[PDB]
Amino acid sequence: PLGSRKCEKAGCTATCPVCFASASERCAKNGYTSRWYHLSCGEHFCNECFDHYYRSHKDGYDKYTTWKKIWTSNGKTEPSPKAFMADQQLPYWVQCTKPECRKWRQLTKEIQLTPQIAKTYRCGMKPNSDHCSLPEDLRVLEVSNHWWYSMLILPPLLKDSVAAPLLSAYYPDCVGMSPSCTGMNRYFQPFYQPNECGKALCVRPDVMELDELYEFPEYSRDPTMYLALRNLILALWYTNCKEALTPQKCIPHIIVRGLVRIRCVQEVERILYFMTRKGLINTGVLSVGADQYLLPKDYHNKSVIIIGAGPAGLAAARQLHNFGIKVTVLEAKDRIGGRVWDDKSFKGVTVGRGAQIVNGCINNPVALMCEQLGISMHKFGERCDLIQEGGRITDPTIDKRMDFHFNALLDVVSEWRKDKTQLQDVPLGEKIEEIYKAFIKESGIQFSELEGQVLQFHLSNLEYACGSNLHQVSARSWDHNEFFAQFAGDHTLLTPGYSVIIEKLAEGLDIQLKSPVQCIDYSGDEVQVTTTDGTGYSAQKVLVTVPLALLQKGAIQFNPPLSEKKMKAINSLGAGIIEKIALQFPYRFWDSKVQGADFFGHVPPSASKRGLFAVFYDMDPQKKHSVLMSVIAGEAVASVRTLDDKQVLQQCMATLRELFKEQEVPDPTKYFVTRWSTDPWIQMAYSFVKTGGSGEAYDIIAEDIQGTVFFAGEATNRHFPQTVTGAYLSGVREASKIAA
């Protein structure tokens, strides 16, 4: 009767507190003590065990001080006795893995929980009967109660998290890991480093993102538990991206003392499903069987028609199929891929007629997919000599000088734009030419004919990037996407081709080729989708991923029609265009002059030849086979429209013979010339912002109609326009919206 049997904590539901520490010879056990300390509704320790560590004259004080020091030196939270108890003394809980038992059990205080123990535990297991039949401790079912966590004192801190090696620059308790704790693909950098500049597809490990706050508002007050589990989940995905990450896989990696572990295990499942739906994990070319769908059955009860089987359409279809949702894709052409189309008949080389370069590999879904497929990319060398007609290699200082001036011209454009509205937008090309003449006139510096020709090369590089002569592109908005964090790291040639990724995304999906959509009717209960031959399809939801030019032409009839606001956005973007030529030779004639560089430039003879085979690419990085690819950009696409393939070839060969004037150039034995501009279902290479337009147009086009008609494709990605990467992510984006 001297002492208490009531917990210190007001509102606590523990009618009988027992001490979990039994660290002091004087432990009150289950009897009366001065004060019962409350870690949770089911966990308390007595006053003398408190004192055993807390007071200097007691034997557990030595342990407390050494822990307090470590906690203090690499931690941010207070090193209180409750914190010491929760980190070092609270006994572990583990769930029996027998499918028909599944009961939670407390381990004896000396046992250190490990992943292997958690993986295989069953009732009764010890390092040295009828154990499953014994009743489950009553405090377990209590953890489910809404209030349980609120009555828990300190947030859990994870031990030996798979995330820890990646977060060594953070204080562990800011990322939900314990301060007392002591060959991943180099393109996987999912976590921001402290005060590192923006990069694409990166999370702060210590801050919840907007969508995370939105889905789990209960964590806005204290995100520790969420952050620890989200970071763990991401770290697990990236350590093995070739298989689906499941709750069962995560649970053995959640290591924390106490009943709170139960709360953690109960939460990791919801967090995992969220990250799956959003496309952060369980993604890329991962494919899962009917018995292994990535989201629970409550997401499964819907049907989707996806129009177009390019990167965007296939990404969405792959995501939704993997989730367990019913998906049908309708593709106009006799092949899947869209602006991914590879030619594999070149001896020992894959040459893309469309996409083949990866711009920024760090965190790039394409790099993730290369890892999953076990394929290699080739990082481009820096060297690109500018070769003149006929033969002269341009002085690198001239190259660098004119590049500097071209960028200076762009810099003053970004000054001029600061006080202009869309109604005041001028062509970038017009504005450059104007500023150039103003600079030429003011300081009377005359550039040589060559310097002028090299400026022209640099100009053609920007026309190349935009897919247009710069007189059609917005001075205000040309580089709008740079406002957002962009993909860091290597620029690579995807040697095996994007087709390898496309084929994997598509495998096992329901895809209807040669089924060009002509009508989408969303006025009724289900969407009615009609092909050009009158074939009928229906689903609850429809995703449109057709190219921008095809929306601009109105090739698909929408009932009800698209809004004026959408039409204005659609028409405010440009349908950019480049074409490619590929040439196979009997031998590598360029080796003597090019000396293993990945590419060489071609200085335009005059303004009228700008963009006409500006850059040639050596298509075998192993330097064995002889294939060159070149590009036709800007005004040069026009000059080529009325030429047949033989004639384009002639001009290319004439160019090469001028570039390598001092030597013989063999005849090509195989070639292609692309005609994307006149491919009826494509009609372009990639989007750009036309004069008067805004980057916002990408968002407006991306906006769903009545949660019923959805839009994806490169021209719907404001952060990452133009690219296979951006198209892929737009598909992942829409799959998330659709699955919600």
Binding site: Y192, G198, A200, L201, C202, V203, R204, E209, L210, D211, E212, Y214, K278, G279, L280, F483, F484, A485, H719, F720, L729, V732, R733, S736, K737
Partner: peptide, 12 residues
Amino acid sequence: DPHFHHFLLSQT
């Protein structure tokens, strides 16, 4: 600032 945020977790 949108110069930083994760594209897939900034959709709301």
